[PDB]
Design an enzyme around this catalytic site. Structure first.
Site, short mmCIF file in Angstrom:
data_model
loop_
_atom_site.label_atom_id
_atom_site.label_comp_id
_atom_site.label_asym_id
_atom_site.label_seq_id
_atom_site.Cartn_x
_atom_site.Cartn_y
_atom_site.Cartn_z
CD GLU A 167 70.42 -2.70 14.69
OE1 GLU A 167 71.25 -1.79 14.39
OE2 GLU A 167 70.76 -3.87 15.07
CG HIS B 258 65.52 0.75 20.16
ND1 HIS B 258 66.72 0.75 19.48
CD2 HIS B 258 65.02 2.00 20.03
CE1 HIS B 258 66.96 1.95 18.99
NE2 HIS B 258 65.94 2.74 19.31
CB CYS B 259 70.17 -1.57 22.53
SG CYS B 259 69.88 -3.22 23.23
CD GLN B 260 73.47 -1.87 17.50
OE1 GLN B 260 74.45 -1.80 18.24
NE2 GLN B 260 73.55 -1.80 16.18
CB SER C 181 66.93 -2.51 25.64
OG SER C 181 67.33 -3.32 24.56
#
Ligand SMILES: CSc1scc2c1-c1nc(SCC(=O)C(C)(C)C)ncc1CC2
Length: 148
Positions: free
Chosen positions: A16, A89-91, A97
């Site tokens: 993120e 993307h994610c985190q 992802s």
């Protein structure tokens, strides 16, 4: 801050914090973003600079990600056919992802699951385990091998 990892020439992986660096996204010819979360903002939307797809998923033991593979694969190649890069993307830990990248590398590069993971892990060293997503990527390999 940090750096969004090139996996293929048009495919990038990050968390993120990586997705909030607008100037690196413009530098890299990124025009497409996949946000694999349910709750974060689409980070530069009101600027009008990128095409976005949200996959609203959680990093949980019950979450289905196979459902989004085909939808995600189209967005990746649309960015490819048009010569722009894509950031997914994610985190932190990028479990969600990375799962999608690995699925792409299986489907469109005919890599095996484990070899696609080894490839991704080489370029992006920190990837949190999630056995639920692993099992999905195994059943995706079999379906891909036995006529998907
Ligand atoms: C496609 S993962 C895979 S295939 C063969 C192995 C692994 C693996 N992966 C991870 S972390 C990444 C994940 O679990 C995902 C979130 C991408 C599903 N830790 C340990 C292992 C054991 C060996």
């Amino acid at each position: 801050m940090a750096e969004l990892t090139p996996i293929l020439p048009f495919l990038f992986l990050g968390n993120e914090q990586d997705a909030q660096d607008l100037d690196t996204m413009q530098r890299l010819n990124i025009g497409y973003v996949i946000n694999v979360t349910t709750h974060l903002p689409l980070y530069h939307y009101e600027k009008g600079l990128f095409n976005y797809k949200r996959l609203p998923a959680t990093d949980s033991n019950k979450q289905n990600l196979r459902q989004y593979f085909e939808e995600a694969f189209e967005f990746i190649e649309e960015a490819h056919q048009c010569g722009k890069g894509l950031l997914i993307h994610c985190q932190a830990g990028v479990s969600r992802s990375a799962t999608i990248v690995i699925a792409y590398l299986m489907k469109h590069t005919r890599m095996t699951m484990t070899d696609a993971y080894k490839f991704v892990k080489g370029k992006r060293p920190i990837i949190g385990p999630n056995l639920n997503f692993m099992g999905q990527l195994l059943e995706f390999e079999e379906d891909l091998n036995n006529g998907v």
